[PDB]
Amino acid sequence: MADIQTERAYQKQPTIFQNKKRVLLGETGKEKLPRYYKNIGLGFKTPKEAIEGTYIDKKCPFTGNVSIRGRILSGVVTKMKMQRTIVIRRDYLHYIRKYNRFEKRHKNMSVHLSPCFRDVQIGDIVTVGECRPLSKTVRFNVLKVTKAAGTKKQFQKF
Amino acid sequence: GISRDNWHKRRKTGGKRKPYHKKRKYELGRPAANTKIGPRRIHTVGVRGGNKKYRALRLDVGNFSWGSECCTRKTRIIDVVYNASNNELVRTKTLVKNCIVLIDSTPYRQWYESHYALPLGRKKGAKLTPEEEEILNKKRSKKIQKKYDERKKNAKISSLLEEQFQQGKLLACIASRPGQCGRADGYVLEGKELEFYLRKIKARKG
Amino acid sequence: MARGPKKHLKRVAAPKHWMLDKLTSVFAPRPSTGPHKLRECLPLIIFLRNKLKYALTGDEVKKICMQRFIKIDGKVRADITYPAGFMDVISIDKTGENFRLIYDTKGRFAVHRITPEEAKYKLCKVRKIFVGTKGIPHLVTHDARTIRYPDPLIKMNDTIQIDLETGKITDFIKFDTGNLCMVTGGANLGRIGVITNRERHPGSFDVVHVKDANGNSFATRLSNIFVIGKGNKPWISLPRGKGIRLTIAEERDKRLAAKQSSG
Amino acid sequence: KNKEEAAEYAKLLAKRMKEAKEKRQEQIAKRRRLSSL
RNA sequence: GAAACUGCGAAUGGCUCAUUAAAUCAGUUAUGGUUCCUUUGGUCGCCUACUUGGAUAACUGUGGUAAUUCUAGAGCUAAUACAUGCCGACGGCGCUGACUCCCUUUGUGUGGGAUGCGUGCAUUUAUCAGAUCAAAACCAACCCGGUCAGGCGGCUUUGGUGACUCUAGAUAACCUCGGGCCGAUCGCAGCCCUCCGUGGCGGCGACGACCCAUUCGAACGUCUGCCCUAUCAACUUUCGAUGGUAGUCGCCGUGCCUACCAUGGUGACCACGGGUGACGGGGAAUCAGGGUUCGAUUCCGGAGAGGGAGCCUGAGAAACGGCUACCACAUCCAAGGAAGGCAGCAGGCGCGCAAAUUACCCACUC
RNA sequence: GCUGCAGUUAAAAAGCUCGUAGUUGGAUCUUGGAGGGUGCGCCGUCCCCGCCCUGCCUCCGAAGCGUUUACUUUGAAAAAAUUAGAGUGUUCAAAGCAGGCCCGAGCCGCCUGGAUACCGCAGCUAGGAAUAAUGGAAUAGGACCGCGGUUCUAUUUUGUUGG
């Protein structure tokens, strides 16, 4: 959790209003914050964390004001140095006829990562989706965390 | 002049982008209104695609709405108290979106007393006897007491807002973009936001 | 370039299906702004002097038009480069001819005379269906005609019989498995046929498996499919050929057999 | 003219209910049969 | 009907390839991130109304300047230029209401009112709305329908897209104001009046406007593909380098910019740096097959008009057959001044291995 | 010199080994009978196909929906010019996109045209399931209202509305 609100500006979802009010129990009222969410589409389940969560993230595909349209890509997570954003490495095959073997090649792609996803840990394969320019670098948003404790080289548990 | 284009600076690779074409009007951009509080002045600006955008420089009244009330009143904007972006904005008393201002309350008070007939805070007897009392006294027998009776329950109003009423100045957050729109509008703070700003207002103050 | 709208067309960079020659000049007509997209249109000038042979010059095409001789969908059009298109009518009166612009199996606007009725109505494919201003709803057809208050069944991709004097939809056809179809673009441009299947993709791109009256099957993008009535029952004239499509060998077999003997 | 179109359109949508309304009924009644068991 | 004013074009075309090496660009995608003239489709009732104010050109006349696409001064004076502002009306409907009846002291329940006084859209803000599902026992209130012996039951509603804070509706205002909109045109030629002079009506033929969509587009965003080089191996930020967060700015996305706050982002899968007989592609040439090389150049996309930078207008231009400064060049002069940009068509100099008429026409193609 | 080079002595295997990147990687997990194309004079010859001597589940469609891919296969999307390449009497041809007829003109006229193909990749579709990788349960886990105690949330419905 950690107090979100943290900054100096009051974090809130736009046009989702309040009004607490008098009388007893709650008190005001118990949830104290109406929350608005939506499913991205493309059959990406909007994870519970999004609905359950307090966090604000405009950039979030479920909780925020961003639409996912365009290319849907998958990549492996190389970095999770930056707050709320990750870098994924995309391997692809380059074909060279002139004589014919193509050589592995890669590209790194910066992509925003909603706090709804966690355990975003380097090594994880992830499915990101195209989006409106979030930041000068970031074109994408993490839609699904593919996972696996597998890759055994260790034993994951639950 | 000013040039939204990235095509200066450096990419992510870090390589020196080489100059392609000049600075192009399509990329065009501008100086800020830096709108300031006081007797109204506005200027028209030519924007892309025809279309005219108001640049407000100096504003004294805005249209601020009391959300929980569901009512909006036009008041003088007294001053700038808090600004997340930059402090100068506050000290200079410059108007921008997200700026936290103090409006004036009197229009809100006049409406509230009239509609609920319970007067805010615990002001005074002499005041009641004077004007606003006349409204309170009202009557029609009849006319209005029945309405006042119907109301009650809400009418609690929230401690933080009422306390502010005593001052005669209410905290509000500028919703609109004065430099763009030419209107300095906003909503009275409240609930949680009001709690956060009060914490900021006292905390930093001293 | 780079400050404004192009006003010229280098001929050669014009759409093939007008079948303008290579020599002649540098520039093709270039369709005015109008009810049909520039690629997908047939500037009257090409119709009057390139298909119908009424005109020789472009100077003549103009002289014809200023008479008022020619109406498109009923309402005299006086521009040389007016962008007429699919489902348009075109009526030259003091000559008594009604023509409907609808495709070859080549994919070429065909010279297709229609009766003095029929000329009354055209079939438009719904492009969007809209709640406009004040709460009114509207449909938008391919040919850029907006009709308010349509009946609530009508949904994007359905087609719609427009009156024509009056505007006014005077019924409709749903897009459902088994409807007759006209192909309005792409490799299969001009083929007519029933349906069979719409394969659906979220994100983007829906394909329509079509089967012709010869059990010939093919796909195109949903964008390219136009509904024109009920199997064996088109709601308009079809051009000779019933948009069939025949192999270059079949095509040769017909060409030599029908003549140098066979009347 | 616009008023006539709006009024006529409402009739078709409102009148359609009669024929469509029956459709729903063929569900409510059955909703009891399945629950029976 | 010379002209002038007005409106529109002049942002297109034509020309060259210098700059420029993931830049440009090609194929693919996209705008749910936005602007869009025009066409096309829609949208237009609330006591000067039978219609408001007053001035500039063309013109006349008088001139100035060595020389000017210079222009003064004055006297007029046109408008679909300019600044205004209305007949139109129509209301029941909202809040207020002299009040009054019935079943019950006070009250409580059920009721209904003569007369007063925000309502067209646009924009901005705030709020609501934008309805998804199956059954029962009791208590407090009260609607109808069939009733006698307090006693039996029961119903009505919300547009679309895979996903929007989408469209649309309701409430409170706001003004972006004089500075949103709702319109202050022509030339040629028989009607009728619950009734008498009026007001209502009739032929031929001569652009604006608000808002929405459309069309031609535009501006950005996706990937995937580029020459040589390591005698270029670490690079990028205190003059933002990568990210958070909020604002200002822009047509709009975005470190665009700025504050604060993090310390990032990239590299042997060649980054960074440098070079270049590099504009990029469709294409071209050489033909076993594989390949090998070129592409400035009749099309597409991009770029520039002596070099650099800035700007006005307008929907669209960072325009040079616009302007403006400097910088480099050149020209006229009565020496104070003043006027200019052939990588447009011809032509000419210089350059070189190398490249045409100082010609005719808008008839074709547009 | 991919296809398709040479390196003992001709120009050319580092003095030798370790070694990261890169490249490269063992075996092993499903087993005649007729339909349609073109030759030869009612007969047959020679391909191609489902067969004989293999998506689950949800509970025909729909939907659930994919273990990841690469690959390959079938579609769409794929500028014109160009190029390969059909139809076409520029007299021939390069070209060009025409033309050829009915007709002796009273025909107050007919009509065929101006194909198609290629189009890298990447992306989009789709079928295959070999090949190459890839998925887990052995410090036990997944399945099936197998069953329960604990707690939460959403709206049908006791006419209506509140507890």
CATH number, domain of A147, equals: 2.40.50.1000
Q: Is C170 on the interface with D (CB under 8 A)?
A: no
Distance measured from the CA of protein residue B29 to the C1' of nucleotide E255, in angstroms: 15
What whole-number distance in Å separates Cα of residue B159 and Cα of residue C157?
58
Which residue does chain A place closest to B154, by CA atoms?
A22
- Residue A126 backbone phi and psi in degrees, to 5: -140, 155
Contacts of C203 in chain A (CB under 8 A): 42, 69, 72
Q: Is residue C128 within 8 Å of C156, Cβ to Cβ? A: yes
* Token pair listed for B99: 């700026």
Q: Which residue has the tokens 């699904």?
A: A144
Give one DSSP letter per residue of B116-152, joined into a string: H-S-STT--HHHHSSTTHHHHH-BSTTTBHHHHHH--
Q: For this experimental structure, what is the resolution in angstroms?
A: 7.0
Contacts of C151 in chain D (CB under 8 A): 9, 12
C260 in a structural domain: no
Q: Is D9 on the interface with C (CB under 8 A)?
A: yes
Q: Is A69 on the interface with C (CB under 8 A)?
A: yes
Q: What secondary structure letter does DSSP report for C47?
A: I
Q: Which residues contact A89 (CB under 8 A, 6 or more apart)?
A: A75, A76, A77, A78, A106, A107, A108
Note whether C133 and C215 are same-domain residues: no
Q: Which residue has the tokens 């007509």?
A: C29
- Burial degree of B172 (CB within 10 A; 0-12, 13-18, 19+): buried
Domain count along chain C: 3
| Helix or strand (DSSP H, E) at C123 | strand C122-131
Dihedral angle, C-alpha B34, B37, B43, B47, nearest 10 ° = 40
Q: Can you give the residue range of the structural domain that contains C80?
A: 2-117
| Helix, strand, coil content of chain C in percent (nearest 5) | 15, 30, 55
Q: How far is CA B169 from the centre of its chain?
A: 12
C251 in a structural domain: no
Q: Is residue A142 within 8 Å of A111, Cβ to Cβ? A: yes
Nearest CA to C219 out of C195, C243, C244 is that of C195
How far is the CA of A64 from the CAs of A39, A134, C68, in angstroms? 11, 12, 58
* Token pair listed for A90: 């995309």
Q: Is residue B183 within 8 Å of B166, Cβ to Cβ? A: no
Q: How many CA atoms lie within 13 A of C200 on its CB side?
A: 2
C263 in a structural domain: no
Give C207's strand partners: C199, C221
A158 in a structural domain: no
What whole-number distance in Å separates Cα of residue C29 and Cα of residue C13?
11
Note whether C49 and C9 are same-domain residues: yes
A95 in a structural domain: yes
How many helices (DSSP H) and strands (DSSP E) are in chain C? 3, 20
C253 in a structural domain: no
How was this entry determined? X-ray
Domain count along chain A: 1
Nearest CA to C85 out of C45, C38, C117 is that of C38
Q: How far is CA D8 from the centre of its chain?
A: 17
What whole-number distance in Å separates Cα of residue A65 and Cα of residue A42?
17
Interchain proximity A9–B98, CB inside 8 Å: yes
What whole-number distance in Å separates Cα of residue C211 and Cα of residue C255?
25
Is the N-terminal amide bond of B142 cis, ω within 30° of 0?
yes
3-state SS, residue C68: coil
Q: Is C168 on the interface with D (CB under 8 A)?
A: no
What whole-number distance in Å separates Cα of residue C100 and Cα of residue C83?
14
Q: Which residues contact A81 (CB under 8 A, 6 or more apart)?
A: A87
Note whether C202 and C104 are same-domain residues: no
Nearest CA to B58 out of B74, B42, B82 is that of B42
Strand order, beta sheet including C192-193: C192-193, C179-183, C225-230, C233-234
Q: How many CA atoms lie within 13 A of B196 on its CB side?
A: 20
| Helix or strand (DSSP H, E) at A93 | strand A85-93
Q: Can you give the residue range of the structural domain that contains A114?
A: 2-152
- Residue B92 backbone phi and psi in degrees, to 5: -75, -20
Interchain proximity C149–D12, CB inside 8 Å: no
3-state SS, residue A12: coil
Q: Is C201 on the interface with A (CB under 8 A)?
A: no
- Burial degree of B162 (CB within 10 A; 0-12, 13-18, 19+): middle
Sign of torsion over alpha carbons B56, B174, B83, A65: negative
Residues within 8 A of A (CB atoms), B 131-170 only: 153-154, 156, 158
Contacts of B193 in chain A (CB under 8 A): 10, 12
Note whether C50 and C78 are same-domain residues: yes
Q: How far is CA C168 from the centre of its chain?
A: 20
Contacts of B153 in chain A (CB under 8 A): 22-23
Strand order, beta sheet including C137-141: C146-148, C137-141, C122-131, C159-162, C169-173
Residues in chain D after which the chain is broken, C→N over 2.5 Å? none
Tell me which of A6, A19, A54 to substitute to probe the interface with B (most B C-beta atoms closer than 10 Å): A19
What whole-number distance in Å separates Cα of residue C27 and Cα of residue C54?
21
Strands B100-102 and B79-82: antiparallel
Distance measured from the CA of protein residue B2 to the C1' of nucleotide E249, in angstroms: 9
Whole-number CA gyration radius for chain D: 16
Q: How many CB pairs under 8 A join A and C?
A: 6
Residues within 8 A of A (CB atoms), B 80-99 only: 84, 98
C252 in a structural domain: no
| Helix, strand, coil content of chain D in percent (nearest 5) | 90, 0, 10
Interchain proximity D5–C151, CB inside 8 Å: no
Q: What secondary structure letter does DSSP report for C40?
A: G
Task: Please name the member of D2, D5, D13 whose beta carbon is closest to the beta carbon of C152.
Answer: D13
Strands B42-46 and B61-66: unpaired
What whole-number distance in Å separates Cα of residue C118 and Cα of residue C237?
9
* Token pair listed for C90: 């075109």
Q: Is residue C7 within 8 Å of C27, Cβ to Cβ? A: no
Q: Which residue has the tokens 């088994």?
A: C178
Q: Is residue B95 within 8 Å of B179, Cβ to Cβ? A: no
Residues within 8 A of A (CB atoms), C 5-44 only: none
Q: What secondary structure letter does DSSP report for A122?
A: T
What whole-number distance in Å separates Cα of residue A129 and Cα of residue A122?
18
What whole-number distance in Å separates Cα of residue C125 and Cα of residue C122?
10
Residue C195: give its domain's CATH number: 2.30.30.30
A20 in a structural domain: yes
Residue C142: give its domain's CATH number: 2.40.50.740
Q: Which residue has the tokens 């009725």?
A: C117
Note whether C167 and C223 are same-domain residues: no
Note whether C11 and C78 are same-domain residues: yes
Q: Is residue A21 within 8 Å of A27, Cβ to Cβ? A: no
| Helix or strand (DSSP H, E) at C17 | none
Residue C41: give its domain's CATH number: 3.10.290.10
A157 in a structural domain: no
3-state SS, residue B77: coil
A121 in a structural domain: yes
Distance measured from the CA of protein residue B146 to the C1' of nucleotide E108, in angstroms: 15
